[PDB]
Copies of this chain bind each other. A is one copy, B any other.
Amino acid sequence: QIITTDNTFVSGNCDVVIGIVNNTVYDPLQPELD
């Protein structure tokens, strides 16, 4: 699946996780631009 807010949830800042990596997390609302 494409990585977005739909299939992921946030928890804390990034320095507390060992082995964390970076990648885009698209928000479907942005293209809508309602």
Question: A-side interface residues toward B, CB under 8 Å?
Answer: 29, 32-34
Contact = CB atoms under 8 A, between A and B. Distances in A.
As for how many copies of this chain the complex holds, the number is 2
Contacts of A33: 32, 34
Nearest to A32: B29
A4 to B, nearest CB: 12
A34 B30 CA distance: 8
A20 B32 CA distance: 28
A25 to B, nearest CB: 15
6 contacts: A29-B29, A29-B32, A29-B34, A32-B33, A32-B34, A33-B34
Contacts of A32: 29, 33-34
